[PDB]
Amino acid sequence: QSKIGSLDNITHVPGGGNKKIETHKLTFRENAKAKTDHGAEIVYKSPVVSGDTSPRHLSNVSSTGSIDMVDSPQLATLADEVSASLAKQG
Amino acid sequence: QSKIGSLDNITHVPGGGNKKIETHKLTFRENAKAKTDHGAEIVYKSPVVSGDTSPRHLSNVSSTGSIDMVDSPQLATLADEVSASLAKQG
Amino acid sequence: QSKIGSLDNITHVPGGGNKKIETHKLTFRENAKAKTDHGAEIVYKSPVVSGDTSPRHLSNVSSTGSIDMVDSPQLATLADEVSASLAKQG
Amino acid sequence: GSVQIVYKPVDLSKVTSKCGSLGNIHH
Amino acid sequence: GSVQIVYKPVDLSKVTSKCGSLGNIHH
Amino acid sequence: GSVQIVYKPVDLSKVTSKCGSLGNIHH
């Protein structure tokens, strides 16, 4: 057994004239799992460059008025650029 | 027996004329694991480079008015550039 | 013993004219574990470089008015650049 | 006149052999 | 004449042999 | 008249031989 007579995730507002009354629940079990095993290989963002490269006069901008991140976690495995706002060259 | 007559994540508001009454529950069990085992290999963001590179006059701006992070943790394994706002070159 | 009739995470507001009544629980078990075992290997941000590299006149800027981090811990393993606002080159 | 000789080869040999499950017994 | 020789070979051998599970018994 | 020789080879050999589980018995 696990849960019986339980009160788990509730808003109860018998009153009047209230505003923005809120209740949040998030559960994360076993997310963002990598398993690489026996004789496997992962090759990630590691190119082989023998050619010559001349990137010039590049401009990159990320701008925002505001970022609100409410109850929004970031879980990352073998990832890189996990974000709310991104501006990217190459 | 995990829970029984139990009251967990609850707002109760019989009062009146109130504002911004909030209740939050986050649980994080075993997230963002990386297991690597036996003969396995991960090669990550490590190029082999033999050609010449000549990046010039590159400009990169990340800007904001504000960042409000609430109830939003960051959990990262073999990750790299995990963020709210991001600007990236090369 | 641990729980029967338990009360875990609650706002009770029977009074009137209140504002900003808040209640938070975050819990974190066994997150961001990395395990490397037997004959395995991880190569991470450690390139092999024999080309010539001549970066010139590079500008990088990270700017904000304010950063609020409430109930937002950072849990990093074999990560690197975990942050709120991020400007990166190379 | 001018002479420039660039010699920069790359060689990336990998061998990964008996990393499986071999001859193991279960009961 | 004027001379430059630039000699920078790169060689990245790896060998991994019996790094698995071999002949183990479970009972 | 000028001569420049720049000799910078790179060798990164690795060998890993018996780092698995071998010949163990569980009872």
From Swiss-Prot, chains D, E, F:
Protein name: Microtubule-associated protein tau
Modified residues (Phosphoserine): 2, 21
Tissue: Expressed in neurons. Isoform PNS-tau is expressed in the peripheral nervous system while the others are expressed in the central nervous system.
Localization annotation: Cytoplasm, Cytosol; Cell membrane; Cytoplasm, Cytoskeleton; Cell projection, Axon
UniProt modification remark: Phosphorylation at serine and threonine residues in S-P or T-P motifs by proline-directed protein kinases (PDPK1, CDK1, CDK5, GSK3, MAPK) (only 2-3 sites per protein in interphase, seven-fold increase in mitosis, and in the form associated with paired helical filaments (PHF-tau)), and at serine residues in K-X-G-S motifs by MAP/microtubule affinity-regulating kinase (MARK1, MARK2, MARK3 or MARK4), causing detachment from microtubules, and their disassembly. Phosphorylation decreases with age. Polyubiquitinated. Requires functional TRAF6 and may provoke SQSTM1-dependent degradation by the proteasome. PHF-tau can be modified by three different forms of polyubiquitination. 'Lys-48'-linked polyubiquitination is the major form, 'Lys-6'-linked and 'Lys-11'-linked polyubiquitination also occur.
Documented effect of changing residue 17 to F: In PIDB; markedly reduced ability of tau to promote microtubule assembly
Modified residues (N6-acetyllysine): 8, 14, 18
Modified residues (N6,N6-dimethyllysine): 8
Residues of the full protein shown: 621 to 647 of 758
Covalent link Glycyl lysine isopeptide (Lys-Gly) (interchain with G-Cter in ubiquitin), residues: 8, 14, 18
Site (Not glycated): 8, 14, 18
Tau/MAP repeat positions: 3-27
UniProt disease annotation: In Alzheimer disease, the neuronal cytoskeleton in the brain is progressively disrupted and replaced by tangles of paired helical filaments (PHF) and straight filaments, mainly composed of hyperphosphorylated forms of TAU (PHF-TAU or AD P-TAU). O-GlcNAcylation is greatly reduced in Alzheimer disease brain cerebral cortex leading to an increase in TAU/MAPT phosphorylations. Frontotemporal dementia 1: A form of dementia characterized by pathologic finding of frontotemporal lobar degeneration, presenile dementia with behavioral changes, deterioration of cognitive capacities and loss of memory. In some cases, parkinsonian symptoms are prominent. Neuropathological changes include frontotemporal atrophy often associated with atrophy of the basal ganglia, substantia nigra, amygdala. In most cases, protein tau deposits are found in glial cells and/or neurons.
Domain of life of the organism encoding this protein: Eukaryota
Subunit structure: Interacts with MARK1, MARK2, MARK3 and MARK4. Interacts with PSMC2 through SQSTM1. Interacts with SQSTM1 when polyubiquitinated. Interacts with FKBP4. Binds to CSNK1D. Interacts with SGK1. Interacts with PIN1. Interacts with LRRK2. Interacts with LRP1, leading to endocytosis; this interaction is reduced in the presence of LRPAP1/RAP.
UniProt remark on domains: The tau/MAP repeat binds to tubulin. Type I isoforms contain 3 repeats while type II isoforms contain 4 repeats.
Role this protein plays: Promotes microtubule assembly and stability, and might be involved in the establishment and maintenance of neuronal polarity. The C-terminus binds axonal microtubules while the N-terminus binds neural plasma membrane components, suggesting that tau functions as a linker protein between both. Axonal polarity is predetermined by TAU/MAPT localization (in the neuronal cell) in the domain of the cell body defined by the centrosome. The short isoforms allow plasticity of the cytoskeleton whereas the longer isoforms may preferentially play a role in its stabilization.
